[PDB]
Structures are given as C-alpha cells and as structure tokens.
Amino acid sequence: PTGTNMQLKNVAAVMVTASYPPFARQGQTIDVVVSSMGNAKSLRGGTLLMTPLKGVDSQVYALAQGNILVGG
Amino acid sequence: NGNIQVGPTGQLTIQGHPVIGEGGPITVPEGSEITIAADGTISALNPGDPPNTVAPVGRLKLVKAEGNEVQRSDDGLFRLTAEAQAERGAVLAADPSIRI
Amino acid sequence: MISSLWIAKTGLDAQQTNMDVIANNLANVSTNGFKRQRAVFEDLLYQTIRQPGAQSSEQTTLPSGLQIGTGVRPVATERLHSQGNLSQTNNSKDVAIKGQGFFQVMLPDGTSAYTRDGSFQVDQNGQLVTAGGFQVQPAITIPANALSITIGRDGVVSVTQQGQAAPVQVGQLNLTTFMNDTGLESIGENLYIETQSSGAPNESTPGLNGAGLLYQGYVETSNVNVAEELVNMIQVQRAYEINSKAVSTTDQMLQKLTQL
Amino acid sequence: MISSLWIAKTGLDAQQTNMDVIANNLANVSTNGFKRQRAVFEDLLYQTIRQPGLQIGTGVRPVATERLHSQGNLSQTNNSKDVAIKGQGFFQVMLPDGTSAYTRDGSFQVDQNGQLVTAGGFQVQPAITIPANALSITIGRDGVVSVTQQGQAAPVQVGQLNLTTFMNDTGLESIGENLYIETQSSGAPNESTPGLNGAGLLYQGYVETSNVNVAEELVNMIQVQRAYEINSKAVSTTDQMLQKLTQL
Amino acid sequence: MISSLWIAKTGLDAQQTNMDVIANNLANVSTNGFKRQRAVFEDLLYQTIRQPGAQSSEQTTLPSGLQIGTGVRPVATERLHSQGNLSQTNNSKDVAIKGQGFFQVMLPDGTSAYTRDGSFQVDQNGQLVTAGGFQVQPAITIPANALSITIGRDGVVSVTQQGQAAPVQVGQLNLTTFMNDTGLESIGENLYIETQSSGAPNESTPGLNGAGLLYQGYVETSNVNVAEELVNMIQVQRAYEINSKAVSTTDQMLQKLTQL
Amino acid sequence: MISSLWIAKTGLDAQQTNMDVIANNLANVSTNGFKRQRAVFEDLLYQTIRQPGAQSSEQTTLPSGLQIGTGVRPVATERLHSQGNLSQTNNSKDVAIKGQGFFQ
C-alpha cells in the first residue's frame, strides 16, 4: 500500500560502476564496484540484486548481480 | 555496575570494559539515544528523526550465578570458580528469566 | 533550584500576561477603531527521560513512557478583526468602515501607516488629517470656502461651493486590504504598519472586490465585550491564586529538606 | 551504605516527579487542546532472603506518564478561522524540516500568501489556499472549507480538512509546542474525512480547552507535600541511626 | 496518601459533577425541546474488618462490625422527560409535540437520530430539514410555489397551491416512541441516538399508540425549573465547602503527624 | 479551569446574544420592510464518562450513564419572514407587497 511505513535494516541503496572492455561481446563477464549511497553502516555480506549498467547514452550494456566482497 | 557510558565511536563500556551482548561486545550507532529494556534490549534513536525509527540494535547478556559459583578476581570482576566452570561451562548461558 | 518552582513561575508569568492583555482591552473601550486582543499559550519542551515506544522487553514495547513537562509560555496575541458597532456622531468629517478595509496615512518619516479609525479633521492648509495630525492618503484637499463635505459609499469626497448647484470633487478615498489582517504591527496611536507576515497592501475602491463601504457621520467603536472581560478576570484571578499556591507548597517542601 | 537512605531518596524523587506533573498540568490550564498528564509509580526490585521466605523492598520509581485523551470543553472565539474537534481526531501539520506532526489546537490563521497555518506558523495538512478577496470562510462539519466571494452567489470549495486518527492516542510523542509525532506505540496514522471511520466532527468558531481538572491537582499537591515530609522524616531517622552507630 | 483524604476527594469531585449538571441545565434554559438532568450517587466500597455476623463467644454473634466505607461515586445522570411549556411563535414551520414522541432525522453518514426540537426549515431543494441542516424523515418535500403550509395534529402535511382551492397532501410526519426514553444517547445538536438500553424505535403516527399530537406554530420550551437550580446551587456550594473543610482537617492531622 | 465555569461562560454569551437580538429588533421598530430576528440554540458536547447502555455485566445493562454535558451554542439567527402591517402613506411612489415577493 502507498500509505505505509517500511523501516528496513538489511537493505542498502548502492551505485554500481564498471568498465566496458574493448571488443566486449554479449555473454562475457566483468568486475563491478559497489558503493553505498546513503547512511549505510556497512556492506559486509550483502548481495547485489539485478542492476542494469547504463552507458553515457543511457542504454543498458551490462546486467549486474552477485555477492560483494568487502575487505574486513 | 550498571553505569553504562557510550563512546564517541558508539561502543558500550563499563569501567573501560566493553559490554558483552548476544553478538559479542556491544557496538551502538554513534550519537544515539539508548533505552535499555526490562530484558536488556537496546533501542537506539537518532536525534532529529521521528520516534517511528526506534529500532533495537542488540541485547545485553544477563547471566545468573549464585555466590557459591563466583570468585572475585584481582581486577574487581567476578568469574566462575573451577568447579562451577566445569559444571556450567566456561561461557555462561544467558538466563531469559532475568529482569533488568 | 527545583523544577516545580520554575514551572509554577512560568505559570504565574503567563497568567500575569493574560491579565495585562485583559487590562489593555478594557482600557481601550472608548477608543474608536480598536480591536480586542486575545493571547494564546503553549507548553514548553518535555523532558525525555524514558523514550516511549522503546522495547520494554524483547517482544514488548513501552506504551506512553515517562515524559516530564516544563511550564507554559505565550505564543502570540491575535486581534479579533470584526466590525465594531457603529455610532452616529453627526459629523461631516467622521467616517466609518462597514467592511474590511483600512485608511492609509503618511508618517512624518515618509513611510505609510494604516489606521481604521475615521475621526478626521482639517489642518490649516486644508488637507484631511487624522486626530494625530497625520495626513490621510490620498491627500484630499478641502478648499477654503466649503459649505458641506459629502463622502459617499464608494469613497468620493465632494465639496459644494456657494451658488453652484453641482458639487466639486476634490479627491477619492480608497481602502487598503491585506491578505493577513492580524499580522500588522501595531505601533499604537491607532496605527498598524505592514510586516512580511501581513502580505502586501492591496489598494481598492470602497465597495469593490472586498473593501468596505464608507459611512459619513459614523464612527466604528471598539469591539470589546465587557462581560466576557469580567468573567475572564475572575478566571485569571483564580488561576493566579492556584499558581501562587503551587509556589507556596514548593516553598514548604524545600523547608523540610533544609531542616533535615 | 546499605541502609534505607536510598529507599527514602527514591521515594522523594517520586514525589518530586508527581509534583512536576501536577505543576505542568496547572501551568497549561489555559492552553487550547491540552491533555492532562498522570504519572504512574510502580516499585523497584525486591531482595529475597532465604531461610535455613522474606523479601525486602528497594523503593519506588516512575514508569510512564499517561495523557488523558478525553474531549475537553469548547469555548468561544467568534473567529471564523478556529475549529474545534468533537470526538477523537488530530489535525496534521507539516513542520519545516519535513516530518508531519499532529496537533489538536484549532486556533488557525491565514498566512501572507493564502494558506492555513497554526499559531506557530506551521502549515496545516491538507494544504488550504484561501483567496485574497474572500468575504467569509466557512468550514463545514465534514471538513469542507468553502469560501464566499463578492458577486458569485455560491461559495467556492477550496479544501478538505482531514483528521488523522491513531488507534492508541496515548502513545504519541509530545514534541513541545502543542504538537505530537507518531511513534512505534501509536503507529499507522489513519487519514480520514471528519465524520466517518470514527473521525470526529468540526465546530467552527470554537476552540477545545484544556482537560485539566483543578480539584484533583490541588488535593494531589497536598498529598505530595505530606508524603515528601514523611520521606524526609524517614531520611532523618536513618541519619540519626547511622550517627548513633558511628559513635561507638 | 491517607484514607480520609481519598474519601473527601471523591466528595469534592462528585459535588462538582452536581455543579456541572446544574450548569448544563442552566445553560440550556432557552433551548427548545431540552430536558433537564439529575445525577444519582451511590456508596463506594466498604472495608470488612470485623465481619458482622461472625460468632463471638461460641453462642453470641457480633452485630454490625467495622464496615469502614470509602467515598461516593455518581451512578448515572437521568433526564426528566416531562412536557415542557408550549410557546406560540406563530410560524408555519414550528411543530410542537404534546405527548411522548420523537421526530426521526437522518444523519448524512447513514444512521438516524431522534430530535424533539420542532423548528424546521426548508433547504434549496424544498425538503423539510432541521435548523442544523439535517434532513427529517420520512422526507417531506415542499413544492416551489407554496402559498401556505399546514401541518395537522395527525402529522399530515398540506400545501395550498395557486389555482387549487383544495390542499394537496405532500407527506406524513410520524413520531418515534421508545420503551425507555432515558436510554437515548444525547450527541448534542438536540439529537439522540438509539442505544441498547432504549429498546428499538417504534414508528407511530401522531395520535395513536401513545405518540403525542403535533401543534403548528408552537415550540416546546425547556422544562428547566430555575428556582430549584438556585437552591441546588446553595447546597452544591455548602457541601463542597464542608468537604474542603474535611480535607483541611485531614491535612492538619497529617502535618502534626509529620512535625512531631 | 473548572468545567462549570466554562459552561456558565457559554451560557452568558448565549444570553448576551439573545439580548443583542432583542435590542436590534427594538431598534428597527419604525423601519419599513423589516424582518425581526430570532436565535436558536443547541446542546454542546456531551462528556461520556460512563456510556449509557454499557454492558456492565453479562446480563445487566447500565441505563442512562454519566452523560455530563458542556454549555450551549447558538445554532443560528434566523429572520422571521412574515407580512408586516400595511400603512397608507398616500404617495404614488410607495408600493407594498402582499405575498412573499422581492424587488430586485
């Protein structure tokens, strides 16, 4: 429902950045960097949900989803 | 000693010794108001935020031990005697019947 | 030194402020174009101690925990901008407003003030001024040999000279209306000035989109209801009694602690 | 040390808290839409002594104050902008920082650009924009704010004054200036039109006065003073007993 | 903190409840179709201590032991449903009930309340409504060009049109009667809502089954007898003073206990 | 501070309103085409300390509980539109209405 209070603690909004390599072909995999965006304490053992990586032209060039590795 | 004091980093210390909770030593969000509960539940409120965001961050580990099972150490803190250690383990299990 | 004494002191000060407002309202009964004032109070802060809604126990929460309040403090005094009852003084220069408009005058400093009182006179130079000598905008000039001054419902000031069957128009009295009428700053002397909470002065003709109608020979008396003031005086006296009793009780308690 | 000084001290502190609550109730006897507070005292832990059965107390501690949400009396303001609530309901008012508080003080004003605000200047949800050339503002029983303009023979609908109802009215946090914020103990602010779903009605030209009864406060002050004297006497007796002990 | 003080507290508050009942009766003297209220009080608890009837000395019982009682609590306020004096106002729309009936009115939220005030008005659509804008049931609609409205004592409503020498019946005004008229819950605005202690609404036309007869041009004034209210003032004041005297005596006793 | 005081305060305002209505009616005796006013009052709030009809026990119900009332409020001030007495001024420009019409 539109009018409701959700107060989550296990979810963080993040920005994912990656490099599109030369001569990249569909189906190949690349590394991504996940950075928190607002008042999150940690991203220790989180899992990145399906994220479309846009280019400068605002077109989806990659789809990101995986487990984050934080140093510790 | 229940005189619990917070730190700038937000960890709970009693006489300089960090307080032990169910997740180990208790770390509380920095600059928050704390309300310990009748069962040791720690609720943290961020100043400025509405009272709708009061969310627990941990639980104090409260244990029950009679005077026969504890001996005083040289630093003022009590610890289980050897017999009581072999009877109830090195690490005491928290008793849920303890009120605070 | 003790909390209850500060709280009761704040209560006493609030009741004294209420009595001051009542006395000011009763002192201006005979003032024309006066609006009675009413003060509104608020409580002050609230000591947190035990945050309500906290986890009382792992599965339960504290319902309505321990909040300790401080005293009281007055928010603001609002005027009651309502048409004061009219009175016939049978004077060609007295003007009363039937609606929601104001007259504009110029202070000696050059700024513009606004007054609802319509007791007007003429100066030695022939301009229409108020009782304090302030020149009423828009500066209606009455000529030397006037026989009668007629101010109509729509604000036209006309002078009938000798031997002329037609009246000579010598000005046009307009009314200024504000979005927030209570937000004006009263400087005394029946004068209100524009503040940023009173919007902007909208000039309008007396009879148009909401300016009031001008009545000649009438004065708008104050809207102070006196029986209400007497009852409120009784109420204020009793409240001050009770607050003083709270102060005295706190005084008696600290005495026993001193004796300890 | 181990004695009765602390028992008596915890007792005095309780009487001090009760007196603070009474003084707060009395100071806000003129505020519009004020709910009186009552402090609840409920004793501390007990120490059990085992025989070869008996339990000694420790004192008393304040737990939580409850605000009495009964409908206060209505008084007259003949001001068209003031509305009182008949029943259970709260006006929603938007604070400058962005979070919405809830108030019952129905003394409102129109600010410099239209807009209905409380006495403190905070804007009142749902936002109303009163036209400048308004001749009379009429707020209906069901919260419809209609505005009359010169010429048109029909009033113009401007806005609806919705009431926010909480299932537990006592758990709201009193933030200070006649405003409450929702809390975990008073969650789910239910917005409704006044008159339906348990919401209260609106009386225009009336303001809801405070709920503070006077006789209760005065007699409670008498009780607090006398109990404070009793606890002070107990403190003095413990002091004399310890003095006699130390002189040995 | 002491028993006598709690007993005296019930006393003061209950004489105030009386005082509130008296003030409410007085404020509604001019209200049409108002019924005066009277409060009933009962004894509070009685501590057993020595049990009356318990056998002492094996063959002798103990009569009337220590039944130490607590204060007083008001049972309930009951309305005096009696016929108020009829006042003639010479209006086609005022209807007065002379018996024991109620008019039925529909609240816009869907439910129906019951009112005795007979000052009726006509909305812009021609319906017979209450002065608060609530639409009477059944539902009397009045034609546009009505010359005279006649409400008979049987509740029939007739309208005299132009060009028609015979009136046309446009409705039938019924009266609602209840098993217990004191059990209706007063919601203000001269309106009663049905409760489970007031039985169920019994519809009856005026003149049969007991419903009263409807008079046109008359209003049923309030039944408040005011000299009785003044005499009740004098008691509600003396009783409150005496209870406050008891409070003061207990206060002095406690003070001397503390001071020693 | 006391509820009885507020109830009396309202009652005083209501009676002052009645007095003002009477004074206004008397002030307009000689004016032509006047309709005298009349004020209507209604019950204010009703404090339900004990609910009338509350189920005190599984068998008995409390009749007519503690309904402590507040003061009074004037519903409105309605004008009595009735035909006033006609008087002959004997001027050609004076007109009178016999029914329920209005000049525009």
UniProtKB/Swiss-Prot annotation, chain A:
It comes from the Bacteria. It is found in: Periplasm; Bacterial flagellum basal body. Assembles around the rod to form the L-ring and probably protects the motor/basal body from shearing forces during rotation. Belongs to the FlgI family. The basal body constitutes a major portion of the flagellar organelle and consists of four rings (L,P,S, and M) mounted on a central rod. This is Flagellar P-ring protein. It comes from Salmonella typhimurium (strain LT2 / SGSC1412 / ATCC 700720). The lineage of its organism: Bacteria, Pseudomonadati, Pseudomonadota, Gammaproteobacteria, Enterobacterales. The chain holds residues 74 to 145 of 365 of the full protein.
Curated annotation (Swiss-Prot), chain B:
The basal body constitutes a major portion of the flagellar organelle and consists of five rings (E,L,P,S, and M) mounted on a central rod. The rod consists of about 26 subunits of FlgG in the distal portion, and FlgB, FlgC and FlgF are thought to build up the proximal portion of the rod with about 6 subunits each. Keywords: Bacterial flagellum. GO terms for biological process: bacterial-type flagellum-dependent swarming motility. The chain holds residues 102 to 201 of 251 of the full protein. Its main location: other. It is found in: Bacterial flagellum basal body. One of its GO terms (cellular component) is bacterial-type flagellum basal body. It comes from the Bacteria. The keyword Glycosyltransferase does not apply. Belongs to the flagella basal body rod proteins family. It comes from Salmonella typhimurium (strain LT2 / SGSC1412 / ATCC 700720). This is Flagellar basal-body rod protein FlgF.
From Swiss-Prot, chains C, E:
Its main location: other. Keywords: Bacterial flagellum. The keyword Isomerase does not apply. One of its GO terms (cellular component) is bacterial-type flagellum. Transmembrane segments: none annotated. Pfam families: Flg_bb_rod, Flg_bbr_C, LlgE_F_G_D1. GO terms for biological process: bacterial-type flagellum-dependent swarming motility. SUPFAM superfamilies: Flagellar hook protein flgE. It comes from the Bacteria. The keyword Acyltransferase does not apply. Signal peptide: none annotated. InterPro entries: Flag_bb_rod_N, Flagellar_basal_body_rod_CS, Flagellar_FlgE/F/G, Flg_bb/hook_C_dom, FlgE/F/G-like, FlgG_G_neg, LlgE_F_G-like_D1. It is found in: Bacterial flagellum basal body. Belongs to the flagella basal body rod proteins family. PANTHER family: FLAGELLAR BASAL-BODY ROD PROTEIN FLGG (PTHR30435:SF19), FLAGELLAR PROTEIN (PTHR30435). The basal body constitutes a major portion of the flagellar organelle and consists of four rings (L,P,S, and M) mounted on a central rod. The rod consists of about 26 subunits of FlgG in the distal portion, and FlgB, FlgC and FlgF are thought to build up the proximal portion of the rod with about 6 subunits each. This is Flagellar basal-body rod protein FlgG. It comes from Salmonella typhimurium (strain LT2 / SGSC1412 / ATCC 700720).
